[PDB]
Amino acid sequence: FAFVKIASDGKGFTRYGEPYLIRGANYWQGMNLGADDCSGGDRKRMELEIKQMAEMGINNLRVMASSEGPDDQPYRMRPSMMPQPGKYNEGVFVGLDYLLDTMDRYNMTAVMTLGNFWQWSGGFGQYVAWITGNQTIPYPVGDVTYDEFTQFAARFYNDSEIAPKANKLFKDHIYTVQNRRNTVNGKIYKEDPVIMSWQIANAPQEAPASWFEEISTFIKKGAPKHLVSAGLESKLDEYDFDRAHDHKNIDYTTCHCWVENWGIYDPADPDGLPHANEYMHDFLESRSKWAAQLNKPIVMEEFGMARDAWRNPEDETYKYLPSTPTSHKDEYYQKAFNQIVSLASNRSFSGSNFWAYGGEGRSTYPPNPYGMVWLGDPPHEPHGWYSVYSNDTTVQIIKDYNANLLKVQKELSK
């Protein structure tokens, strides 16, 4: 009962024997906000943000169920859930238990991201540092490029000496999360129907098919009642999409669309929005076809856009202020959402998770005593870059999309 499944025609999800469309948000800060105050959380704020997301019609949060220390590293969540391999900060782990229990109380499902290619939860670069014994990770700041960081972190699955060791540690972490007993409601994670899926990691970068095969099968054997996702961006071509998704134990497909990060969209250009709308339009259509070729659902489980930096393009801070409007972002979200509603009524898309809900956090607030300004932008990025705040104009467009998708879900159930 209540476990999310794949429809028997392979074209969407079901839940309670009916179609289940994803009215989703990203809430990767949920575990750290759920923690007690002692461990830097603000659980009353977390409860309020999940209430706000429920009033906006959200039924699904993609959340981060890993974070690696050590806790003196820059650009990452602090305090980490797993400060050393196999050694856990119980106060952070309790935060993930409270996050899942509060989602349970709002009848939301969770996509549980078990790791991260990127540096903001420690991630694959940090397992590489643990194995090589060198804690100097080449973070992509100053003179160090993203290519250099990427080649370093990709040793996690590409280097024949590092990868078996790093992946032993990573599987120990997956095993520990899937076997966690929720201290709030007593459920073991692998039997909790609030979890929609286990997700291998956020955004592996050209990882080999044999690694997707190995880890997806490890996770499925660990929690056979749950769906398994790859966490891929699908930012390359159809082969890269198949290398991640064409596996017996990968139940559905994802895509992440990031127009600014990929050089497509300039938020400081008053005339720059149409490039992003056109790119998002062709991205949804093409990725929908790639998913149809494998006969598996697809969710756009991350996408987002900056505030209106173009109104004051010479002022760098202005781009990140909560008072700055989000006209471009609102129109971009609206058109993406309208297209998804359309593809979904044709059983060609299953929903999306905008990146990311910032809630009551604001980019102008001081860091908490662990140096965290919690909101929807992780600490390797400028605070407030993509966050959707509780009273942004974008909230009504998200609310209208989630009503529209729930209407499509009803029509698909008749």
Number of helices: 12
Terminal CA distance = 21 Å
Series of H and E elements: EEEEHHEHEHHHHEHEHEHEHEEEH
Strand content: 5-15%
Mind describing the biggest β-sheet?
6 strands, parallel
CATH topology name: TIM Barrel
The geometry reads as globular
Give the total of beta strands.
13
Q: CATH homologous superfamily?
A: Glycosidases
- Spatial strand sequence of the major β-sheet: 8-7-6-5-4-11
- Total discrete domains: 1
Q: Which class best fits the helix and strand makeup?
A: alpha/beta
**Reported CATH architecture:** Alpha-Beta Barrel
User: What is the CA-based Rg, rounded?
Assistant: 20 Å
CATH class: Alpha Beta
Oligomeric state as shown: monomer
State the helicity in percent bands: 25-40%
Q: What's this, in brief?
A:
This protein is of the alpha/beta class and 414 residues long.
Could you give the topology of this structure?
Blueprint (H helix, E strand, L loop, with lengths): L4 E2 L6 E3 L2 E3 L1 E5 L3 H5 L8 H13 L4 E5 L25 H16 L3 E5 L9 H10 L13 H8 L1 H4 L3 H17 L16 E5 L9 H14 L4 E3 L8 H8 L7 E5 L15 H22 L3 E6 L23 H19 L5 E4 L2 E3 L28 E2 L4 H20 L1
Parallel strand pairs: 4-5, 4-11, 5-6, 6-7, 7-8, 9-10, 12-13
Antiparallel strand pairs: 1-2, 2-3
Helix pairs in contact: 2-3, 4-5, 4-7, 7-8, 10-11, 11-12
